[PDB]
């Protein structure tokens, strides 16, 4: 089940949600939260509709009339004529799947290196080697917020995270960084959060 | 439709063939009056329900 992206909502509307169907190789190619890009064909699917208003019956074209005691009236006649309601839903049949915004042009560092192209890999390498990368990342990630350099640095470290670990007895050592911002109103806290999300 | 010549060597008595029948249900006693019988040598299969 997918729903329309926020970039396409009309005014005052609720996003339209439709079910798309993946077949064969693509069966598990979409995961929750992903901004996928389904390519395929729209289709209709017969529906067992609960509409109490009759509509669009389909029946035989052979003119047959029940004899006395077996008249084509009621459920008997409906069944004999083969009357069925033509109620449909719109469903999407996706042959291929792919993210809307590709990140690159199990998981491991070598896997990421291979997945990313030569230009992207060289850019990553050169920025990794670049000096003052800490300040560069902070500034490039928060180009509108002034001050709060400590908050910027903390959020960057949170984004990079730690190294989760598990002890011999089983107890786990959390490696994720938790950050909280407390302060006076209009101090850019929501701005930091929205930067992080976007 | 055929027109043929012959000689009648027998003639059965004149009996009563129903052209309409009224069938009544045993349980509710409701009727299905005026069921059009076919003409000639032919029978009728009563409704089962
Ligand atoms: N230190 C700051 N530097 C740049 N802009 C700021 C700063 N503090 C507040 N603002 C501006 O004030 C606006 C409202 O801030 P807001 O996100 O509501 O903070 P809070 O949620 O903590 O009240 C923001 O859109 C932001 O541009
Ligand atoms: Mg706020
Ligand atoms: Zn009866």
UniProtKB/Swiss-Prot annotation, chain A:
Modification Phosphothreonine occurs at: 72
Binding site for ATP: 146, 186-190
Modified how: O-glycosylated (O-GlcNAcylated), in a cell cycle-dependent manner.
Residues bearing the modification Phosphoserine: 13, 65
Subcellular location: Nucleus; Chromosome
Gene Ontology terms describing biological process: DNA replication; DNA replication initiation; double-strand break repair via break-induced replication; mitotic DNA replication; regulation of DNA-templated DNA replication initiation
Domain of life: Eukaryota
Record's keyword terms, sorted: Acetylation, ATP-binding, Cell cycle, Chromosome, DNA replication, DNA-binding, Glycoprotein, Helicase, Hydrolase, Nucleotide-binding, Nucleus, Phosphoprotein
Listed GO MF terms: ATP binding; ATP hydrolysis activity; DNA helicase activity; identical protein binding; single-stranded DNA binding
Cellular component GO terms, alphabetical: chromosome, telomeric region; CMG complex; cytosol; MCM complex; nucleoplasm; nucleus
Described purpose of this protein according to its UniProt entry: Acts as a component of the MCM2-7 complex (MCM complex) which is the replicative helicase essential for 'once per cell cycle' DNA replication initiation and elongation in eukaryotic cells. Core component of CDC45-MCM-GINS (CMG) helicase, the molecular machine that unwinds template DNA during replication, and around which the replisome is built.
Additional remarks: Early fractionation of eukaryotic MCM proteins yielded a variety of dimeric, trimeric and tetrameric complexes with unclear biological significance. Specifically a MCM467 subcomplex is shown to have in vitro helicase activity which is inhibited by the MCM2 subunit. The MCM2-7 hexamer is the proposed physiological active complex.
Family: Belongs to the MCM family.
Subunit structure: Component of the MCM2-7 complex. The complex forms a toroidal hexameric ring with the proposed subunit order MCM2-MCM6-MCM4-MCM7-MCM3-MCM5. Component of the CMG helicase complex, a hexameric ring of related MCM2-7 subunits stabilized by CDC45 and the tetrameric GINS complex. May interact with MCM10. Interacts with TIPIN. Interacts with CDT1. Interacts with MCMBP. Interacts with DDI2.
Protein name as catalogued: DNA replication licensing factor MCM6
Lineage: Eukaryota, Metazoa, Chordata, Craniata, Vertebrata
Gene that produces this protein: MCM6
Swiss-Prot record, chain B:
Secretion signal, residue range per the UniProt entry: none
Record's subcellular location: Nucleus; Chromosome
Residue ranges that the Swiss-Prot or TrEMBL entry lists as coiled coil: none
Domain of life, source organism: Eukaryota
Family per record: Belongs to the MCM family.
Other remarks on this protein: Early fractionation of eukaryotic MCM proteins yielded a variety of dimeric, trimeric and tetrameric complexes with unclear biological significance. The MCM2-7 hexamer is the proposed physiological active complex.
Function: Acts as a component of the MCM2-7 complex (MCM complex) which is the replicative helicase essential for 'once per cell cycle' DNA replication initiation and elongation in eukaryotic cells. Core component of CDC45-MCM-GINS (CMG) helicase, the molecular machine that unwinds template DNA during replication, and around which the replisome is built.
Assembly, per entry: Component of the MCM2-7 complex. The complex forms a toroidal hexameric ring with the proposed subunit order MCM2-MCM6-MCM4-MCM7-MCM3-MCM5. Component of the CMG helicase complex, a hexameric ring of related MCM2-7 subunits stabilized by CDC45 and the tetrameric GINS complex. Interacts with ANKRD17. Interacts with MCMBP. Interacts with TONSL; the interaction is direct.
Disorder noted: Meier-Gorlin syndrome 8: A form of Meier-Gorlin syndrome, a syndrome characterized by bilateral microtia, aplasia/hypoplasia of the patellae, and severe intrauterine and postnatal growth retardation with short stature and poor weight gain. Additional clinical findings include anomalies of cranial sutures, microcephaly, apparently low-set and simple ears, microstomia, full lips, highly arched or cleft palate, micrognathia, genitourinary tract anomalies, and various skeletal anomalies.
Protein name in UniProt: DNA replication licensing factor MCM5
Organism of this sequence: Homo sapiens
Portion of the parent chain present: 148 to 196 of 734
């Amino acid at each position: 089940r997918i729903q329309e992206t926020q970039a396409e909502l009309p005014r005052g509307s609720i996003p339209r949600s439709l079910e798309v169907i993946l077949r064969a190789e693509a069966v598990e190619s979409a995961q929750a939260g992903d901004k996928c890009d389904f390519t395929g064909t729209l289709i209709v699917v017969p529906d067992v509709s609960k509409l109490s208003t009759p509509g669009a019956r389909a029946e035989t074209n052979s003119r047959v009339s029940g004899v006395d005691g077996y008249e084509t009236e009621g459920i008997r006649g409906l069944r004999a004529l083969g009357v069925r309601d033509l109620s449909y839903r719109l469903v999407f049949l996706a042959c291929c799947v792919a993210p809307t915004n590709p990140r690159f042009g199990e998981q491991t560092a070598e896997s990421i290196k291979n997945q990313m192209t030569v230009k992207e890999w060289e850019k990553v390498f050169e920025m990794s080697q670049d000096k003052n990368l800490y300040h560069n990342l902070c500034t490039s990630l928060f180009p509108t917020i002034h001050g709060n350099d400590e908050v910027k640095r903390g959020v960057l470290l949170m984004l990079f995270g730690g190294v989760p670990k598990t002890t011999g007895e089983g107890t786990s050592l959390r490696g994720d960084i938790n950050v909280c911002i407390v302060g006076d109103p209009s101090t850019a806290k929501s701005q930091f959060l929205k930067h992080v999300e976007e | 439709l055929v027109k043929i010549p012959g000689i009648i060597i027998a003639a059965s008595a004149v009996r009563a063939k129903a052209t309409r029948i009224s069938i009544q249900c045993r349980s509710c006693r409701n009727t299905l009056t005026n069921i059009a019988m076919r003409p000639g040598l032919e029978g009728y299969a009563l409704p089962r329900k």
